[PDB]
Amino acid sequence: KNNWVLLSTVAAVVLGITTGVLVREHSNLSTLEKFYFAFPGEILMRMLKLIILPLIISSMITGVAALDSNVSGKIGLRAVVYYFCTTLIAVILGIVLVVSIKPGVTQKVGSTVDAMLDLIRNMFPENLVQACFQQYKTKREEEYKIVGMYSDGINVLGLIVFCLVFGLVIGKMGEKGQILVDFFNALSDATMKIVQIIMCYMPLGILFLIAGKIIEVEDWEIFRKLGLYMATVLTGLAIHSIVILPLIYFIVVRKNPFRFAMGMAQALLTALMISSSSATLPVTFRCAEENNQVDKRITRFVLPVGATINMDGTALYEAVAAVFIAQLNDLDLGIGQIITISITATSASIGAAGVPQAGLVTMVIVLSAVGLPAEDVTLIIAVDWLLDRFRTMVNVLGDAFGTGIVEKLSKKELEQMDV
Amino acid sequence: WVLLSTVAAVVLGITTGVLVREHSNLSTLEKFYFAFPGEILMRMLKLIILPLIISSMITGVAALDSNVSGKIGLRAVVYYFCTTLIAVILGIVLVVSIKPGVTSTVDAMLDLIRNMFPENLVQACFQQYKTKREEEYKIVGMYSDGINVLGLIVFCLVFGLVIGKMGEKGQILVDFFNALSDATMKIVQIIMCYMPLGILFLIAGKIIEVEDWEIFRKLGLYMATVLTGLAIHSIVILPLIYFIVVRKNPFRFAMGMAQALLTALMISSSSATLPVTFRCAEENNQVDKRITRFVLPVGATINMDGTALYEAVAAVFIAQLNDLDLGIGQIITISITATSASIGAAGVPQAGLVTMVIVLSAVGLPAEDVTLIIAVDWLLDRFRTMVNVLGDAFGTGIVEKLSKKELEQMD
Amino acid sequence: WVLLSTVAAVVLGITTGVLVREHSNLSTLEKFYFAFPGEILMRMLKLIILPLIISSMITGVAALDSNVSGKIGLRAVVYYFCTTLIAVILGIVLVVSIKPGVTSTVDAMLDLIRNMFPENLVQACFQQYKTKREEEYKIVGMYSDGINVLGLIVFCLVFGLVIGKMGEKGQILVDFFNALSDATMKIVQIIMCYMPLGILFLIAGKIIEVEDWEIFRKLGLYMATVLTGLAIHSIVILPLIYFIVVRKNPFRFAMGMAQALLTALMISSSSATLPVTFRCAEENNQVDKRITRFVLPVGATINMDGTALYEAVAAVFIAQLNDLDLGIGQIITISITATSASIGAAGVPQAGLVTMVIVLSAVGLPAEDVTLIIAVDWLLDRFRTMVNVLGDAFGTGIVEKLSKKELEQMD
Numbered sequence A: 001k002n003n004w005v006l007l008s009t010v011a012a013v014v015l016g017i018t019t020g021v022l023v024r025e026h027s028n029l030s031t032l033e034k035f036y037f038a039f040p041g042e043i044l045m046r047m048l049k050l051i052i053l054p055l056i057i058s059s060m061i062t063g064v065a066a067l068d069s070n071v072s073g074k075i076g077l078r079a080v081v082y083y084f085c086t087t088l089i090a091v092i093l094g095i096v097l098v099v100s101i102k103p104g105v106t107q108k109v110g111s112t113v114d115a116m117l118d119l120i121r122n123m124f125p126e127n128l129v130q131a132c133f134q135q136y137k138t139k140r141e142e143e144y145k146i147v148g149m150y151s152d153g154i155n156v157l158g159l160i161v162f163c164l165v166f167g168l169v170i171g172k173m174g175e176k177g178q179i180l181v182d183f184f185n186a187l188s189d190a191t192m193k194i195v196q197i198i199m200c201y202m203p204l205g206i207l208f209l210i211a212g213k214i215i216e217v218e219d220w221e222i223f224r225k226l227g228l229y230m231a232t233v234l235t236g237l238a239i240h241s242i243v244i245l246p247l248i249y250f251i252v253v254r255k256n257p258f259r260f261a262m263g264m265a266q267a268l269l270t271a272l273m274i275s276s277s278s279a280t281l282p283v284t285f286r287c288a289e290e291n292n293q294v295d296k297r298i299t300r301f302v303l304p305v306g307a308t309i310n311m312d313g314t315a316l317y318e319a320v321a322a323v324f325i326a327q328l329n330d331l332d333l334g335i336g337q338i339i340t341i342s343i344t345a346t347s348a349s350i351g352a353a354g355v356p357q358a359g360l361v362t363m364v365i366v367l368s369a370v371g372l373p374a375e376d377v378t379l380i381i382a383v384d385w386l387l388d389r390f391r392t393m394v395n396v397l398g399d400a401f402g403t404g405i406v407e408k409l410s411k412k413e414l415e416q417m418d419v
Numbered sequence B, C: 001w002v003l004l005s006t007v008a009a010v011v012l013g014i015t016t017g018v019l020v021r022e023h024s025n026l027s028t029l030e031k032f033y034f035a036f037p038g039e040i041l042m043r044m045l046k047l048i049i050l051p052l053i054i055s056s057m058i059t060g061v062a063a064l065d066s067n068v069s070g071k072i073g074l075r076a077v078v079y080y081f082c083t084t085l086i087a088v089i090l091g092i093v094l095v096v097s098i099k100p101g102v103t104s105t106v107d108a109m110l111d112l113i114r115n116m117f118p119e120n121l122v123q124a125c126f127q128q129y130k131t132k133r134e135e136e137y138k139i140v141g142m143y144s145d146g147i148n149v150l151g152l153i154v155f156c157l158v159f160g161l162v163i164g165k166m167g168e169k170g171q172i173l174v175d176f177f178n179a180l181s182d183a184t185m186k187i188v189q190i191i192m193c194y195m196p197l198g199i200l201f202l203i204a205g206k207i208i209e210v211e212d213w214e215i216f217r218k219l220g221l222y223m224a225t226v227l228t229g230l231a232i233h234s235i236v237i238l239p240l241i242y243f244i245v246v247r248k249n250p251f252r253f254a255m256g257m258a259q260a261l262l263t264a265l266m267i268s269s270s271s272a273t274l275p276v277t278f279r280c281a282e283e284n285n286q287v288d289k290r291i292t293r294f295v296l297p298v299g300a301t302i303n304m305d306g307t308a309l310y311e312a313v314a315a316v317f318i319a320q321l322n323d324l325d326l327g328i329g330q331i332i333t334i335s336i337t338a339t340s341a342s343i344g345a346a347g348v349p350q351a352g353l354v355t356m357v358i359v360l361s362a363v364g365l366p367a368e369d370v371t372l373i374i375a376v377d378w379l380l381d382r383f384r385t386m387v388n389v390l391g392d393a394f395g396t397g398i399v400e401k402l403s404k405k406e407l408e409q410m411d
């Protein structure tokens, strides 16, 4: 006998690929019948969005309160240094692969500061209850006057920053704040058993979520018309995630880096089907501490921060497609335009959310930084549901690799705390 | 005390409503300021339903995880759920067929399941997902306003189940919500001391706005729907469920309970008639003492068959008073919230009014029309407690035949 | 330190504000990016007022349920509430009559009561009910945005009272909100370390936008309104309240406290001036040691008479700077929020700026205009602490005459 959690998800990917292809050649469902056929995939999607509010709140508090305010200054330093050391490698390796292959040549016909100051406006929200379901967005309009309104979507950057300060303040209070450690440890345990309930609906949900995604109109634009551009994203997403990211693991940890990737197979195949790193963050929590046995004092801090900051897969997809958009024109892309692409794609991957189809909101940032218009993104919208699933597996993998790398880099400081 | 000061609110509220309408002339504005002390009560009730739903669901389910004594504890909880769901379904069918108060359907059933699993817990406290088929058609959601009662009931049932299985690790969460449910049950008692002042100005606001004698024929047909439902459930349904599993003449079982039904009328409390209905089951119908010491204590605060049927009837009567038909996605929302109002009020007779506000807010009905339910509630509250103790009485005979192998082994 | 580093923030914000305006030319866009580090401080302050209101109200009211020593404990709490309410009313009348900053009435009082009892606790954290008379007229509510400070103060007062009466059952709720209030009082101290960097860029954003010399004539009339209110309250009001109940020449009582008032100017802290004003009341004014050991400890964190008057004046001065008149429903919202700011700041002199943001958010005033309050706050902060210990000094003499029968019986 073996495990039924992973073997039924693979059996649902197989039974979901062969279902969403066969119902196209056999029957002809309307646009309304293609929304009720993907309805069990919608219930799984909003069952995972439901659990990330008590999961991010309770893991960020008990992840930092378990560290004695100077160990957490070095876990925090070894996390941001790792996140900058992987985004920069994924941006540079995506830059070299897109200018040596040159996919965009001779197939020509076929508010950056306001978006970066909205990261700091979202780290310190005006209300904590409003931060649980609303984000802040800034538009510039009239010699112009800045005016912002509250859009929708959970402010993950503002609940991480407040609970990081709330986690540090609680741990320095001693016995006067011990009841707040016990409250958010019993809440982080109770909202991980709920994730084990959603994990039993997950094979039934993927089987209709991936059958209702490949049920679209034309398999020709993805295959041949926009071909060899997907062969520059997916090659870089392969080499960064198979070769480069288990080489950073193998240098500092001598413990077989593909044994770690096999133990994260449920979280990798979830983001490969649901295309959202924040929604599969509960799967990444369980599949790291239970399978790979990485210490709970680090995964509660590294994994929520990395889900909204470390987005290596977006950084490579930003660096490939923005050059490819510029390659459909006849721009030179000199030595000054290349480095500013690799710089602003690092900030756009930081400012991008873990929500689905968040790759094209921050694509306007990198495109307008080189001078391209914002309405040149309409060439990419055709194939974006497939390229948004392979760059989320890599995003989850990057976060997972960090937990193992920071733990060996701080095995002494974790062993410092004793009786 | 609280019955005498509510009947006094109705009598002083009817006499005020006819000495103001007949002896003065108010505009549309002064008739709004006259019903202002009742408007404060209607939003003091909606204020408290959010910590009442959350704390009573988590504590009631986590108490049932600790009270179940194997198979005897499980058969009593299963029996309490079916009779409550049958009494609600009997109440829904009777109020839809008779219709007192009068004179797509697939997108409403999928909105039912989308609201059980909301996308956020904080938006579930004040917003509901509603969908709209439009344009060969498209589908758009809107996230309209009003508290999502189904999303909070379903989450806190799953959350309350998880803390019960955690044991020692989650004992601080059981202790937190126990003190949270005791605190908000004391705020409900504070609101029920303001309630006779609020019902007075809110009954009198209705008497000003009437011109007919037809609203009293609708209130008379509402009492004749509840009393019909309480008669079918106590003579036709609950003796039949006894006779399906126990072939032992259920009406002879009911005459043996005759001392317990009369004292459920005088005291009018299902928990305060316990020490008479303990002995009246054992001295007369020869039921085992091991089943009676469990079924009747937990049944006087869980098995609410007359309350659930009454809440189901009263909410559709308000939804027929204001001219609606509820479709089918709102009728199931009545049938879950009225069934879960057994757990959602943690064994308190105070919360009979606020659980009606939970059922009216689960659909989106105007809560200011609950005074017509309250104005005739004192007539029917005596008869609800008689059905609430009859389902407890019939439970001792049903669980005994299902657990006859458990009574030769545990001794 | 914190006084020395805010005066340095105002001087280096004025020196930056006059070397940028006079030596450059910014557009409407660059004037918004220059004041961006002060805009982050203005939303770090609004971030913390929601757990500060909730935790300090629940813990402060439940502490007062445990601190009252029968009749001596009740007379001191009652005295602290009337003088604070008189100093606010004196501050409201003085800022309305003088008006520094210049050059229906029944729907605003009923919106006051509708907002004390909101229809939902989660929407009360970010939304406020507002009504609109329209059409022989009708009345419609809208639920506009902005945090309902009155709904959170009134609920957590009722909630904090209930946990105090629960005792052992609610002891986990007292310990939860005590650790929650100790935690958010430490986050407020973190924000006050960023505050000198934030006031620098937010003062300099104001100096760029000025073209007149009229904002400083209004700031001079604002300091001459607070100092007038502190002079009327300490010479005319508080000696009169002493003379009504104690016929013992209140200026001789004040001269016996002369050593405690002068050391309240040097240290400028009301809790750190306790061991001098203990002996200076007993060695000179012959106060009982049993009354002094209660009134002065609890009065240094509750009786804030000079701060409450100052908060009332500063919020209407901002509401006259931005051209409004507040009607009367917003003036009562000042008079409740500034009075309840004694409990809503758990005895800390750091939190003087963040309680002003609570008063400005209770009405809906722009919180970014609080830098003109801060730029002259260091001049007035010395004189607020002298009045804050004078109400403590006059409190020991007033309660002893009221409780002379409780001092012949406990011995």
Ligand SMILES: N[C@@H](CC(=O)O)C(=O)O
Pocket: A275, A276, A277, A278, A311, A313, A314, A352, A353, A354, A355, A356, A357, A358, A359, A360, A388, A391, A392, A395
């Ligand atoms: N859902 C995607 C968004 C993107 O980066 O395109 C992610 O979390 O990685």
Ligand code: NA
Pocket: A082, A083, A084, A085, A086, A087, A088, A309, A310, A311, A312, A398
């Ligand atoms: Na990275």
Ligand code: NA
Pocket: A277, A306, A307, A308, A309, A310, A311, A312, A395, A396, A398, A399
């Ligand atoms: Na990530």
Ligand code: NA
Pocket: A307, A308, A309, A310, A311, A348, A349, A350, A351, A352, A353, A354
């Ligand atoms: Na990001």
